[PDB]
Structure formats: C-alpha cells, structure tokens
Design a protein around this ligand. Sequence first.
Ligand SMILES: [Mg+2]
Ligand SMILES: [Mg+2]
Ligand SMILES: [Mg+2]
Ligand SMILES: [Mg+2]
Ligand SMILES: [Mg+2]
Ligand SMILES: [Mg+2]
Ligand SMILES: [Mg+2]
Ligand SMILES: [Mg+2]
Ligand SMILES: [Mg+2]
Ligand SMILES: [Mg+2]
Ligand SMILES: [Mg+2]
Ligand SMILES: [Mg+2]
Ligand SMILES: [Mg+2]
Ligand SMILES: [Mg+2]
Ligand SMILES: [Mg+2]
Ligand SMILES: [Mg+2]
Ligand SMILES: [Mg+2]
Ligand SMILES: [Mg+2]
Ligand SMILES: [Mg+2]
Ligand SMILES: [Mg+2]
Ligand SMILES: [Mg+2]
Ligand SMILES: [Mg+2]
Ligand SMILES: [Mg+2]
Ligand SMILES: [Mg+2]
Ligand SMILES: [Mg+2]
Ligand SMILES: [Mg+2]
Ligand SMILES: [Mg+2]
Ligand SMILES: [Mg+2]
Ligand SMILES: [Mg+2]
Ligand SMILES: [Mg+2]
Ligand SMILES: [Mg+2]
Ligand SMILES: [Mg+2]
Ligand SMILES: [Mg+2]
Ligand SMILES: [Mg+2]
Ligand SMILES: [Mg+2]
Ligand SMILES: [Mg+2]
Ligand SMILES: [Mg+2]
Ligand SMILES: [Mg+2]
Ligand SMILES: [Mg+2]
Ligand SMILES: [Mg+2]
Ligand SMILES: [Mg+2]
Ligand SMILES: [Mg+2]
Ligand SMILES: [Mg+2]
Ligand SMILES: [Mg+2]
Ligand SMILES: [Mg+2]
Ligand SMILES: [Mg+2]
Ligand SMILES: [Mg+2]
Ligand SMILES: [Mg+2]
Ligand SMILES: [Mg+2]
Ligand SMILES: [Mg+2]
Ligand SMILES: [Mg+2]
Ligand SMILES: [Mg+2]
Ligand SMILES: [Mg+2]
Ligand SMILES: [Mg+2]
Ligand SMILES: [Mg+2]
Ligand SMILES: [Mg+2]
Ligand SMILES: [Mg+2]
Ligand SMILES: [Mg+2]
Ligand SMILES: [Mg+2]
Ligand SMILES: [Mg+2]
Ligand SMILES: [Mg+2]
Ligand SMILES: [Mg+2]
Ligand SMILES: [Mg+2]
Ligand SMILES: [Mg+2]
Ligand SMILES: [Mg+2]
Ligand SMILES: [Mg+2]
Ligand SMILES: [Mg+2]
Ligand SMILES: [Mg+2]
Ligand SMILES: [Mg+2]
Ligand SMILES: [Mg+2]
Ligand SMILES: [Mg+2]
Ligand SMILES: [Mg+2]
Ligand SMILES: [Mg+2]
Ligand SMILES: [Mg+2]
Ligand SMILES: [Mg+2]
Lengths: 88, 82, 122, 80
Amino acid sequence: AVKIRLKRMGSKKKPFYRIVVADSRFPRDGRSIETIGTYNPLLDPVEVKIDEEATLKWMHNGAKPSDTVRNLLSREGIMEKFHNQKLG
Amino acid sequence: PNIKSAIKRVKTAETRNSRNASQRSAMRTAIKKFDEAAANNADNAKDLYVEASKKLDSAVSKGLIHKNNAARNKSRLAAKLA
Amino acid sequence: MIQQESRMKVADNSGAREVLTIKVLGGSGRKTANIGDVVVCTVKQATPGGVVKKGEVVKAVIVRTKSGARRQDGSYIKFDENACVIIRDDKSPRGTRIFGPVARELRENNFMKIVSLAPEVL
Amino acid sequence: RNQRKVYTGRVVSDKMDKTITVVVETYKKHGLYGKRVKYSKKFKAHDENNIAKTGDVVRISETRPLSATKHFRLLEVVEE
RNA sequence: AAAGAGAGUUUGAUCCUGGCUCAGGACGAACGCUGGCGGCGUGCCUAAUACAUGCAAGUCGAACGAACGGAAGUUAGUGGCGGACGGGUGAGUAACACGUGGGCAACCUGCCUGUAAGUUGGGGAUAACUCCGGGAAACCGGGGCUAAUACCGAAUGAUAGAGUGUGGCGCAUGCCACGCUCUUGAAAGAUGGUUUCGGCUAUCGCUUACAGAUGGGCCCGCGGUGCAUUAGCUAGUUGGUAGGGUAAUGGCCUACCAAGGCAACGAUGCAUAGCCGACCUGAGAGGGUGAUCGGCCACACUGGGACUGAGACACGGCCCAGACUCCUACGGGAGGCAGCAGUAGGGAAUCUUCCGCAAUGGACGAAAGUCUGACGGAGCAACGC
RNA sequence: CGGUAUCUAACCAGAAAGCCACGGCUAACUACGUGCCAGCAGCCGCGGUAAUACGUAGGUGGCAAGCGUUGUCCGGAUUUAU
RNA sequence: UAAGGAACUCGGCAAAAUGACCCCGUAACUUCGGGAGAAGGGGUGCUCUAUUAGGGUGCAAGCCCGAGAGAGCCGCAGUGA
Ligand SMILES: [Mg+2]
Ligand SMILES: [Mg+2]
Ligand SMILES: [Mg+2]
Ligand SMILES: [Mg+2]
Ligand SMILES: [Mg+2]
Ligand SMILES: [Mg+2]
Ligand SMILES: [Mg+2]
Ligand SMILES: [Mg+2]
Ligand SMILES: [Mg+2]
Ligand SMILES: [Mg+2]
Ligand SMILES: [Mg+2]
Ligand SMILES: [Mg+2]
Ligand SMILES: [Mg+2]
Ligand SMILES: [Mg+2]
Ligand SMILES: [Mg+2]
Ligand SMILES: [Mg+2]
Ligand SMILES: [Mg+2]
Ligand SMILES: [Mg+2]
Ligand SMILES: [Mg+2]
Ligand SMILES: [Mg+2]
Ligand SMILES: [Mg+2]
Ligand SMILES: [Mg+2]
Ligand SMILES: [Mg+2]
Ligand SMILES: [Mg+2]
Ligand SMILES: [Mg+2]
Ligand SMILES: [Mg+2]
Ligand SMILES: [Mg+2]
Ligand SMILES: [Mg+2]
Ligand SMILES: [Mg+2]
Ligand SMILES: [Mg+2]
Ligand SMILES: [Mg+2]
Ligand SMILES: [Mg+2]
Ligand SMILES: [Mg+2]
Ligand SMILES: [Mg+2]
Ligand SMILES: [Mg+2]
Ligand SMILES: [Mg+2]
Ligand SMILES: [Mg+2]
Ligand SMILES: [Mg+2]
Ligand SMILES: [Mg+2]
Ligand SMILES: [Mg+2]
Ligand SMILES: [Mg+2]
Ligand SMILES: [Mg+2]
Ligand SMILES: [Mg+2]
Ligand SMILES: [Mg+2]
Ligand SMILES: [Mg+2]
Ligand SMILES: [Mg+2]
Ligand SMILES: [Mg+2]
Ligand SMILES: [Mg+2]
Ligand SMILES: [Mg+2]
Ligand SMILES: [Mg+2]
Ligand SMILES: [Mg+2]
Ligand SMILES: [Mg+2]
Ligand SMILES: [Mg+2]
Ligand SMILES: [Mg+2]
Ligand SMILES: [Mg+2]
Ligand SMILES: [Mg+2]
Ligand SMILES: [Mg+2]
Ligand SMILES: [Mg+2]
Ligand SMILES: [Mg+2]
Ligand SMILES: [Mg+2]
Ligand SMILES: [Mg+2]
Ligand SMILES: [Mg+2]
Ligand SMILES: [Mg+2]
Ligand SMILES: [Mg+2]
Ligand SMILES: [Mg+2]
Ligand SMILES: [Mg+2]
Ligand SMILES: [Mg+2]
Ligand SMILES: [Mg+2]
Ligand SMILES: [Mg+2]
Ligand SMILES: [Mg+2]
Ligand SMILES: [Mg+2]
Ligand SMILES: [Mg+2]
Ligand SMILES: [Mg+2]
Ligand SMILES: [Mg+2]
Ligand SMILES: [Mg+2]
C-alpha cells in the first residue's frame, strides 16, 4: 500500500524532512517513488512547500497520508480539494 | 521453534496440509478416470467431464489452485473428449 | 579368535583406519585374544591429517568379533566384523568418539570410558 | 502498437529443419584508439517453410522464444 | 572556459641512450614521542573462526467456551493478520549477476483507491475442558462434552470452458468489441440507531468481476579480467513432430525423428572477483579501488527436500544426513550472534553486556494501546575534517 | 536526550607545547666527545686523534595538539608514447 | 570345513581363485604397429504384448532367422550342470 510520508535527513538534533511517496515495505531512507516537498519543523512558524498537484493525482490512485502529513495537507488546504473533487 | 508465535505456525500448517492433500488427490482421481474412459470411447466419457469440471473450479473457490490452472486443464481435457 | 597377522578395523576417532596385530598379551604361549583383550598392533592404513600415523606401533582393545562371547545364562552374541579401539597406557581411549555397537563384556574388564562413549552396549 | 526489433543479415547454414543461421555484420569503434572494426555474431531465425537458402540476404524480426536458442523469425528474402 | 616545474647518480672531462632514487597528494590504517577543548563524521580490512549471558516479532475480547467483583467493570487457548518487512555479511558467482536500453499479442500480484452485482438457506465436527494410560524429561496415546468470521454440501450468480454469429483490426504465432446456445463456479458475521417485535439502517467486514496504483517473473542488443607454456568442446547436446507441467514462452520435462550446435571476432579449461552510483590521483586522456551512504544480487553451521501462503524452497519456521556442544534414569532428547551489546581466538590493528519509544517509519487493532537493539540519543578511541 | 545547548555575575595570567630536520637534493650552523670504533643512510655517500653528515649541547628552520616512521595507490615516468 | 588368511617354506611348491556372450571404459611408455582381453565395472532365467519391427526362401501356400523395448513371475543363486 503506497502512502506518502516524511523522510528524515539533516544533522544530529537538526532534523529536516522531505515529503516522499513510497511503499510501506521499503526503508525509511531508501527507495521512493517520487518527491513532493519538504518540511522544516525547527522554524518556529513551520514552513512547508508542496506540489498541490502530484498529491491530488496520487490520492486518487490509493495513497494515504500519515499522521503528520494529514495535518500538513489540511493546514495548507488541499484535503478540501480532495473532498470536492471526490463528490463532484 | 523458540518464538511463541512460531510454535502455532508449525502445527496450524499441518492441519492445512491435511485438508489440502485430501481434496487435491480427489481432483486427480476424477481426471484419472476420465482420460482412461476417453480412450475406451465409452458413453460415460461425456458425463465424466462434468464433475471433473466441477472438481477443478471448486478448488479455485477453496483457493488451493490458480484460476489459470483450472481454466487451462478444462480446455485441454475437452479436446480429448472426441 | 584373533591371533598374530590378523587384521581388524578400528572403530574410534583417532587417525587410524585398519590395524594388523603383532602380539597377544597375557601369557607365554598364548595364541588367541577375544572381546576385552588388549593386543599390540601396528597401523596399516590411516586417514590424512589424523593423530595416529601410518606404520606406528600401538596397543588396543578388541571391542567386537565375528565369534563373540557366551554368557553365564546360556546366551551368545556375534557381530559381523572384527573391530578395535586404540587405547592409552591406562584404559582410556585415544579418540573422542566410538562407532558401532560394543559388547557388554568390556564393562566387566573396567573399560568404563569406552562403554560411556559407545552408542550402544549390547 | 509498440514495435519489436528487426535486423538484416546473410544466411550461413540451413542443415537444420525449419530454421536458418544468419550472420549480422556491424561496426563498432575501438574503445581507446577509435578505429571502426568488423563485428559479426550470428543469430537463429525461424524458417516457416524452408524458403531461405544458403547465401541469401534476409530480414529477421524479434519474437518470443521459439526454442532454446531461437528468438527471431524470418521476414523477407531480399537477395538470393 | 581550462591548460603540463624538476633534481641526484655511469666519465679524467663531454654529449646521448637508459635504469634506480627523491621532492606532491590520499588512507576504515598501524607503530614511536607527546597531548587542552568544542562541532560534524568514522571505528574487526584477519578466522563466512567457536560462542557464555541478556534483549532483537508480535497483535486482536468489536470472531468463539474463564479468574477478581451481589453477578457491574479489567487479564490464558481455537481463529485472523503479521513473521517473505525492518537488520547482518561478501563466502560463492566470469553469468542476462550488474549498468544502460527495449519486448511480453507469453505473465502474476495480499494490503491500498474507484465502480457494478449480492451477502440466501443447512450439516457434521474438534481444540479448550474432564477422566484413564505411557515416559526420567521432552512430551505422546485412549474415552466423553462444547462454540465460532473454524470446516463441508445446497439455491442463485461468469467476459471460466465448449460450440458460434457479426463487425473493426494487427507484427507471423494472433488482438479488440458486441450477440446467441450449453455446462461448471460464492459468501460471515460483529458493534450501534430506529421501530414494534415485522423490518429498516450506520460502520468494519465477506464473495465475484473490471479498472488504477504498487511489487515481482521471463526474454533480448550493447558494456566492463589474467593465461595459448589452456585447441578443440558438447549428446538433452542442436532442430522438428505430439504430449506433460508452469502465473506465463521455452528441451523446462518426456516419446519419436534427423545430426546437428559453439569456437582463432578466442569455445573449453585454470586463476582471481559480488556489480554499480561513486572514491583517490591526474593538465587532460587515463591508472588504482569498490570500507562508510544509496540501488540490485547471493548467503544464513555444511549438503538435500518440500509444506503453508498473494508472496519463501523461508536469518531468530519444518523434515533427513554430516561435524561440533550440551542434558540423560542409556530408552532417547536440545541447539545455531555473517541481529544489538559482550566473550575467547587470530592479528600490527579496531568501541558499551547503556537510555527511550518523546520525533520518523514499521506490524496488529475500530481506538486508546501493545511490540520495535529499526530508529532517536548517550558512552569509549587525536581515527579524520 | 536533559537542567543538555544557550546567557550574565564575580576571581584568576594564573592549570594548558610538543615533534622532526640543519653536506646536496631541501628552508635552517657553531662548540665539545669519539677516532673505519661507536655509529648514520632515500640516493650520492659520511666516520682511519681540528666530523656544518656519528652522540650531546647552544642556535636556527618547518609544522603544531601534534609531529615522525612503515605499508598500499596515483603523479613526477613520454618508463607501453591514441 | 568354524575364526584367522602366507603367520608355512629355500621359494605362495601344491591347492584355491578368474574363465562364455553383449555393453561401458582403459595408464606409463613406444620402434607409432602396439602396450590391450591393460586395469575397473554392468547385463543374462521364465510369461505376455508377439507367427513383432525387420530379414532369407517361394508364384502363393507356407517354412526358417529373431534386436530393441515395455509390463509382470519365481528362487539363496538365472553362461543355475
Ligand atoms: Mg514549533
Ligand atoms: Mg457448490
Ligand atoms: Mg666519477
Ligand atoms: Mg632518466
Ligand atoms: Mg602535483
Ligand atoms: Mg611527501
Ligand atoms: Mg591528556
Ligand atoms: Mg598516551
Ligand atoms: Mg569481515
Ligand atoms: Mg562456513
Ligand atoms: Mg542463548
Ligand atoms: Mg524492548
Ligand atoms: Mg467478549
Ligand atoms: Mg474488528
Ligand atoms: Mg489470550
Ligand atoms: Mg533484506
Ligand atoms: Mg563473494
Ligand atoms: Mg559490499
Ligand atoms: Mg532493465
Ligand atoms: Mg456437533
Ligand atoms: Mg481427546
Ligand atoms: Mg473425541
Ligand atoms: Mg450458477
Ligand atoms: Mg453454484
Ligand atoms: Mg477482499
Ligand atoms: Mg525487492
Ligand atoms: Mg523463460
Ligand atoms: Mg556479456
Ligand atoms: Mg510444444
Ligand atoms: Mg537445456
Ligand atoms: Mg570461459
Ligand atoms: Mg601526467
Ligand atoms: Mg576519469
Ligand atoms: Mg564491516
Ligand atoms: Mg559461523
Ligand atoms: Mg501455496
Ligand atoms: Mg534451506
Ligand atoms: Mg524467518
Ligand atoms: Mg533466498
Ligand atoms: Mg529477513
Ligand atoms: Mg540467530
Ligand atoms: Mg541435531
Ligand atoms: Mg555482534
Ligand atoms: Mg582480542
Ligand atoms: Mg593476540
Ligand atoms: Mg515510536
Ligand atoms: Mg508511530
Ligand atoms: Mg486498519
Ligand atoms: Mg518483546
Ligand atoms: Mg531498548
Ligand atoms: Mg543509532
Ligand atoms: Mg577528537
Ligand atoms: Mg597515536
Ligand atoms: Mg542550572
Ligand atoms: Mg551574556
Ligand atoms: Mg584579571
Ligand atoms: Mg640550503
Ligand atoms: Mg672533533
Ligand atoms: Mg644530513
Ligand atoms: Mg650531528
Ligand atoms: Mg638543541
Ligand atoms: Mg622551534
Ligand atoms: Mg587544527
Ligand atoms: Mg599522520
Ligand atoms: Mg610510505
Ligand atoms: Mg604514463
Ligand atoms: Mg577354513
Ligand atoms: Mg569362513
Ligand atoms: Mg582377506
Ligand atoms: Mg602378501
Ligand atoms: Mg619360520
Ligand atoms: Mg631365504
Ligand atoms: Mg602353482
Ligand atoms: Mg512381422
Ligand atoms: Mg555354467
């Protein structure tokens, strides 16, 4: 089951996450299908950059955001679009 | 075994082995008594194709044979019917 | 019934494979040894890389024979080949494992370690 | 429709049934000096009706494996 | 754009040819003398040698029969899913193993997403439990009783099979769409709202079919090593005909028929070696390497085999054989650190038997939640920047 | 992780410098001891009672929490030369 | 003739052992012919398919020759002396 999740990279006690699409089976920092965006939690206003087009393409093919990703996509505001394109 | 979840697997697989071997050899007997009937051109050759067909695709629903395997064998037996 | 020039297989873990008997200990004109009897012998065939080499003079104990022993209760035992175990100055074997069945008569001769190591004491 | 690969060579042997041996000649420059060199490796093609004869110039197309070694089929007989 | 340094040494003295040596850079390095700190990384290259002792794979009572509680509320076994992922090692392998580019009209795919049909009616058991019997122990038999989303028939339902009609087609074998006749193939309930109780209904499920996505299987062109003081190699070998088997083509296997196939453009044999992205050096072209990080492969004490499953011929699963260690009441039994630490040995040479699931990602669950030596951190060593 | 990183308040020049070379290649030289001995060395080669080459001092030169030696690879090597 | 198997003896003298047909395979050395039946192994009986597949003979009737296979059956043993 392919799902979108964070990927930890950076230095010791300085994490930086890169939103990727990959299977659950593959390692956390291993194979991935493609990359969507990044996520910096250290910045006090957390800044995130997303494709907003590859995500919606993937979520109509059987992709599920994880716990932290869903908060990111909701705050950015594309799960509304996933709502509207589903029923419309 | 020495992981508690592994002791169950070794003994629950034997129960599946027992049930599978029993009805897998039931399938082969129906085929065994068809091709010999086809050679003799008896009247039983026609209706021995039906339960052999019934045995083959019942095994698919039971899940111990692939649907391509069942579909293939039925076609090849039908040729021998003459 | 094993006398001089008799040639018997060795049934332990030392380097030897086959043995020819030189002398039957235990008397002046003695001419035969049987199960449980120590015999002086020489190595005619050895496995490569073993402890005991070819052409070496050693003593050993007979452990099973084609003409076995009779018991006080009137019963007999007979094997299919003549086998041997190479021992030290005392009654301790020079190998670490023993192959095949072993006659019970070795216990009464106080060959306790060999009986302990044997896979079957018949 | 995706298209398979087609080659062109010269028949060498027809002593086998239903098949021919075709040598394909090709160029390839040397790795370090840079001089073009002949390179020929022969294939196996399926002769449906033994049409092709020794020495002919033919065209062969790629297919699924027809046998242990054959995975090409004869297409045209350009020259005899 | 970039763009290349020489020196010493044969002679009584010289100019050429020519070898040897030196000045530079880099290590997973070691040794010698010395030694303050912080940040970021690295640390068995040898014996794929043998392994004490702890922990690394479980979860679900919202699928089915118990103990505390005056019978409210929380905790073993059957059953489902997961253990094929994550983690380790480089032995073997000179070949479609890998890199790069294609083909599959010759293939499969649990969980995930969408859509369409339904989820109707029965039967016989068996664990647990309770007695008896055997053995030192591992553990094995016999009698009786019970349930389930456990198991087995039944009604209805195929683009599954056979026989056809049409069209539109393609790359030879052949493909796509629709229609007709005949024969086979399915299922499970649980937790709640309403009503009345009939019944309806929400959620998670269950069966069949088709799409997408994902992960794999097979075939092919080209590319990357030493020896000719290694010249022939092969017989299921090479092709064909019929059948068997597989998810799928194929000598993959079998019977028959013929004698073919490969090689001086280096077959065969011996020796060595996991492959690549990349790393070091170099003006460049090249030369040497493949530790750490990422992708693929092979292996799991040494050989062989298969079962269960969507997926294995399976690191902490099973059976047989072998070597080794251990427990035996002599009848028989139990094991596998190339998982994280740690021990002995080898070596010139390499670390703690530590703290947590708080973050990320995994398995189970409807969810809190449980498991996670993955992973986050900490400890030792001027090993490097 | 962890009262960790990070601030501000005060006292102390106080606890904190070694390693290798100095004939040429190659930056850096004088005394004393020894007398083909002890010894040095990558090459040329130094030592046989005035040694800038052996051993120790003073001084100097390269680096510095380092500095030297050994092993392996590329360069210089146009010394396999497309 | 049990167990042993040259311990006998000047010396394996004498005796024992191998022995037919078909198939596989075969070394040093060589004067290139050999060595060579080197060595070392495997199969043999009877019944059915079977007047076989196919050959010799004849104008036909018929007669003679007889490989491969499959399935079986019986003994301690199938060139059973
Ligand atoms: Mg914040
Ligand atoms: Mg049915
Ligand atoms: Mg001179
Ligand atoms: Mg020169
Ligand atoms: Mg340089
Ligand atoms: Mg240097
Ligand atoms: Mg210190
Ligand atoms: Mg120190
Ligand atoms: Mg290692
Ligand atoms: Mg090993
Ligand atoms: Mg243990
Ligand atoms: Mg734990
Ligand atoms: Mg309950
Ligand atoms: Mg549930
Ligand atoms: Mg329980
Ligand atoms: Mg793995
Ligand atoms: Mg390897
Ligand atoms: Mg590796
Ligand atoms: Mg590829
Ligand atoms: Mg019942
Ligand atoms: Mg019972
Ligand atoms: Mg019962
Ligand atoms: Mg139906
Ligand atoms: Mg039905
Ligand atoms: Mg389903
Ligand atoms: Mg994979
Ligand atoms: Mg294939
Ligand atoms: Mg190749
Ligand atoms: Mg075929
Ligand atoms: Mg083959
Ligand atoms: Mg080769
Ligand atoms: Mg250069
Ligand atoms: Mg380069
Ligand atoms: Mg390592
Ligand atoms: Mg080991
Ligand atoms: Mg299966
Ligand atoms: Mg295995
Ligand atoms: Mg496993
Ligand atoms: Mg494997
Ligand atoms: Mg694994
Ligand atoms: Mg283990
Ligand atoms: Mg064992
Ligand atoms: Mg370890
Ligand atoms: Mg050690
Ligand atoms: Mg040591
Ligand atoms: Mg966690
Ligand atoms: Mg989590
Ligand atoms: Mg779920
Ligand atoms: Mg645990
Ligand atoms: Mg822990
Ligand atoms: Mg870690
Ligand atoms: Mg440090
Ligand atoms: Mg040091
Ligand atoms: Mg404080
Ligand atoms: Mg401050
Ligand atoms: Mg002050
Ligand atoms: Mg100078
Ligand atoms: Mg002086
Ligand atoms: Mg000097
Ligand atoms: Mg000096
Ligand atoms: Mg000084
Ligand atoms: Mg100084
Ligand atoms: Mg520094
Ligand atoms: Mg250094
Ligand atoms: Mg060096
Ligand atoms: Mg060069
Ligand atoms: Mg006799
Ligand atoms: Mg006898
Ligand atoms: Mg003999
Ligand atoms: Mg003799
Ligand atoms: Mg005598
Ligand atoms: Mg004499
Ligand atoms: Mg004679
Ligand atoms: Mg005939
Ligand atoms: Mg005879």
